[PDB]
């Protein structure tokens, strides 16, 4: 089997991407944030505290003939941005772009933090990291990909995120028309439950490539590119007027400046992030100060190849017995 679904930016800045997902019988379609940095499929629901729902589409298990309470199961998650949610668990039929899993754990939110409430466009998350990070207790549950894997033509999914445009998540096949050149594959460590890999270095604009190992995660659920402070400083030093603002909480730059590209290494290959991808617009409406899309990972404790980086590539998440990551230009 295979599946193919279009993923759409939630706003004009590509702050996140939503993908339609069918849950239950008859289908209830929710727009979920596909997140390769976490491993819970959770949704706004009929059980979510009313004051914490503000425009989202909810899953109502009682209206699904295939929904079954996973008795005694609870879940609770906190994300790197300080957001959180928690609740109980059902199993139900879940389909993504034609690909169907029966008995998928669908984690029903009883509580969500303000960040989620305030984002009317995201109805929940669909985690695509390794199932070892799944928070369901007492019995850890498998991700949608893990459950689908054996049925897939090939045990892979791919992320092809658009710049200010829709893109595609595919399951079970590699669309050879979707990228240029070849796909370069690189080793993955699953020891922390992430799609963790080591970039071979970087360049800033037309500058010479610096060979240096950068360990980080491929995370579709994180907006920006978070790299070591040395790397980030070298980038913004090439932008006139750029500075790190403690009050804003990262690097900002005058919107009149031109941003250089940023290149990162995948083995001997190179992915180029165009300068425009690194512009996340005014810090506040009407401001001439713009927020940068490359920020320091210092104090996160891990480097994150988020959407800024990933949307410059066609990315293969290979869930073969020994997982790997593939990157191609497009």
Alpha carbon of 26 to those of 20, 23, 44, 59, 323: distances in Å? 15, 8, 17, 11, 35
DSSP single-letter state for residue 145: H
Q: Are 228 and 296 in contact (CB under 8 A)?
A: yes
145 token code pair: 């990909």
| Phi, psi for 316 (deg, rounded to 5) | -100, 120
61 token code pair: 């298990």
CATH number reported for the structural domain that contains residue 248 in this entry: 2.40.70.10
Rg of the chain's alpha carbons, rounded to an integer?
Answer: 20
The DSSP bridge partners found for residue 68 are 91
Q: Return d(Cα 253, Cα 239) in angstroms, integer.
A: 7
Residues 181 and 299 in one domain: yes
Residues 158 and 184 in one domain: no
Identified catalytic residue from 14, 35, 88, 92: 35
Q: Return d(Cα 240, Cα 231) in angstroms, integer.
A: 17
Q: How many domains does the chain have?
A: 2
Cβ neighbour number for residue 114 with a 10 Å cutoff: 11
DSSP single-letter state for residue 235: H
- Give the domain-ending residue among 174, 196, 217: 174
Q: Return d(Cα 235, Cα 121) in angstroms, integer.
A: 32
Alpha carbon of 73 to those of 68, 87, 280: distances in Å? 12, 9, 39
Residues 305 and 198 in one domain: yes
Residues 116 and 56 in one domain: yes
Catalytic residue status for 35: yes
Residues 154 and 55 in one domain: yes
241 token code pair: 């007027």
Residues 121 and 77 in one domain: yes
Q: Return d(Cα 162, Cα 274) in angstroms, integer.
A: 13
Alpha carbon of 94 to those of 46, 65, 163, 209: distances in Å? 17, 13, 28, 44
The alpha carbon of residue 311 and the mean position of all alpha carbons in its chain are separated, in whole angstroms, by 10
Identified catalytic residue from 95, 199, 261, 297: 199
Residues 88 and 132 in one domain: yes
Q: Is 268 left (phi over 0), alpha (psi -120 to 50) or beta?
A: alpha
Domain boundaries, position 192? 175-330
Residues 164 and 227 in one domain: no
Q: Are 30 and 107 in contact (CB under 8 A)?
A: no
Torsion angle defined by CA atoms of residues 99, 13, 327 and 250, in that order, rounded to the nearest 10 degrees: -130
Alpha carbon of 151 to those of 19, 129, 284: distances in Å? 21, 18, 47
Identify the H or E element spanning 233.
helix 229-236
* Elucidation method: X-ray
- Give the domain-ending residue among 149, 174, 199: 174
Q: Return d(Cα 70, Cα 177) in angstroms, integer.
A: 41
Q: Return d(Cα 73, Cα 70) in angstroms, integer.
A: 6
DSSP string covering 294-327: EEE-TTTSSEEE-HHHHTTSEEEEE-SSS-EEEE
Cβ neighbour number for residue 153 with a 10 Å cutoff: 11
Per the listing, tokens 């009407």 go with 286
Per the listing, tokens 């590699």 go with 174
CA angle 302, 307, 313 (to 5 degrees): 110
């Amino acid at each position: 089997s295979t599946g193919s679904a279009t993923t759409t930016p939630i706003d004009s800045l590509d702050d996140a991407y939503i993908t339609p997902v069918q849950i239950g019988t008859p289908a209830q379609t929710l727009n979920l944030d596909f997140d390769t940095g976490s491993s819970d499929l959770w949704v706004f629901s009929s059980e979510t505290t009313a004051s914490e729902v503000d425009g989202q589409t909810i899953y109502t298990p009682s209206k699904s003939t295939t929904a079954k309470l996973l008795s005694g199961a609870t879940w609770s998650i906190s994300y790197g941005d300080g957001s959180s949610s928690s609740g109980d668990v059902y199993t139900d039929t879940v389909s993504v772009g034609g690909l169907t899993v029966t008995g998928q754990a669908v984690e029903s939110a009883k509580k969500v933090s303000s960040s989620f409430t305030e984002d009317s466009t995201i109805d929940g998350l669909l985690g695509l990291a390794f199932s070892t990070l799944n928070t369901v207790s007492p019995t850890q549950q498998k991700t949608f990909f893990d459950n689908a894997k054996a049925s897939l033509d090939s045990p892979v999914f791919t992320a092809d995120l658009g710049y200010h445009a829709p893109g595609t998540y595919n399951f079970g096949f590699i669309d050879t028309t979707a990228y240029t050149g070849s796909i370069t594959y690189t080793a993955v460590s699953t020891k922390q439950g992430f799609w963790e890999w080591t970039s071979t270095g970087y360049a800033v604009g037309s500058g010479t490539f610096k060979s240096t190992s950068i360990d980080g995660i491929a995370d579709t659920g994180t907006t920006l590119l978070y790299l070591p402070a040395t790397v980030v400083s070298a980038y913004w030093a090439q932008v006139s007027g750029a500075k790190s603002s403690s009050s804003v909480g990262g690097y900002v730059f005058p919107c009149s400046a031109t941003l250089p590209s940023f290149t990162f290494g995948v083995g001997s290959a190179r992915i180029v992030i165009p300068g425009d991808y690194i512009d996340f617009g005014p810090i506040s409406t009407g401001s001439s100060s713009c927020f940068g899309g490359i920020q320091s990972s210092a104090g996160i404790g891990i480097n994150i190849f988020g959407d800024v980086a990933l949307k410059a590539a066609f990315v293969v998440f290979n869930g073969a017995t020994t997982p790997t990551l593939g990157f191609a230009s497009k």
